[PDB]
Amino acid sequence: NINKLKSSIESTNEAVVKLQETAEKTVYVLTALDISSQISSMNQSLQQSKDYIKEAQRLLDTV
Amino acid sequence: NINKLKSSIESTNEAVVKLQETAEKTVYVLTALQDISSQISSMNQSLQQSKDYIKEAQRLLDTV
Amino acid sequence: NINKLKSSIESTNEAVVKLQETAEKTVYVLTALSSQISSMNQSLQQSKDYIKEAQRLLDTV
């Protein structure tokens, strides 16, 4: 149960890293206002984040 | 203590999902800036839920 | 290990509070449209550190 929880939380942290990365890009775009390249970056980082949290929930349900 | 931790993480995850919904709206508004008020309103919606969720996780975590 | 997990999840949660704060300031800069942007950077870097620490503490579980 502990190893599981540990596994689930690890994926949760990955998801947070990705949103942070996404927030990072947002900061850059706000200043500006190559936004096109940043908007794409933001979207993919947000993609991985969403996959990451879905895996976290899925595993958590395993506990 | 496990069920508590698990229940704590669940709300954490929900809070994470809500930031993600807020971020996707961000990407949309930033794109647009090139209804925006309705989108911002929407960002506040999911951002409030996110805060409610993590406040839930935090409270639950103290229960362990 | 129940202690480390909890301690590690606490940093995760703090990391999330910081992202929400970063998000709030985001809504603020969006409605505005400098210092607010610097503020954003601040709560975001804090988030980065808190998440960094959660991982580290996690690794010892």
Helices (H), chain A: 2-32, 35-60
State the CATH number of the domain containing residue C40: 1.10.287.770
Residues in chain C: 61
- What span, in angstroms and rounded, lies between the C-alpha atoms of C45 and A59? 29
Quick one: resolution in A?
2.2
Burial of C31 (0-12, 13-18, 19+ CB in 10 A): exposed
DSSP chain B: -HHHHHHHHHHHHHHHHHHHHHHHHHHHHHHH---HHHHHHHHHHHHHHHHHHHHHHHHHHTT-
- What span, in angstroms and rounded, lies between the C-alpha atoms of B21 and A17? 16
**Distances, alpha carbon C17 to alpha carbons A11, A35, C26, C43, in Å:** 18, 27, 14, 9
Within C2-52, strands assigned E span none
Of the candidates B58, B13, B18, A57, the one whose C-alpha atom is nearest the C-alpha of residue C6 is B58
Contact B9 A56 (CB under 8 A): yes
Of the candidates C9, C20, C24, the beta carbon closest to that of B9 is on C9
With tokens 């349900």, the residue in question is A61
Which experimental method was this entry solved with? X-ray
Q: Does B37 touch chain A (CB under 8 A)?
A: no
Give B58 to chain A, closest Cα distance, Å.
15
Buried b (16+ CB within 10 A) or exposed e, B32-48: eeeeeeeebebbeebbe
Of the candidates B1, B3, B12, B4, the one whose C-alpha atom is nearest the C-alpha of residue B60 is B4
Which residues have C-beta within 8 Å of that of residue A30, sequence separation ≥ 6? Answer: B30, C26, C29, C30, C33, C37, C40
Take residue A50 and report the two structure tokens written for it. 């969403």
Give B45 to chain A, closest Cα distance, Å.
18
Contact A23 B23 (CB under 8 A): yes
The dihedral over CA atoms of A56, A57, A61, B4, expressed in degrees to the nearest 10, equals 90
**Total domain count for chain B?**
1
Q: What are the two backbone dihedrals, phi and then psi, of residue A14, each rounded to the nearest 5 degrees? A: -60, -45
Q: Side chain identity at C31, as an amino acid letter? A: T
With tokens 């540990």, the residue in question is A6
User: C9 lies in which domain range?
Assistant: 1-61
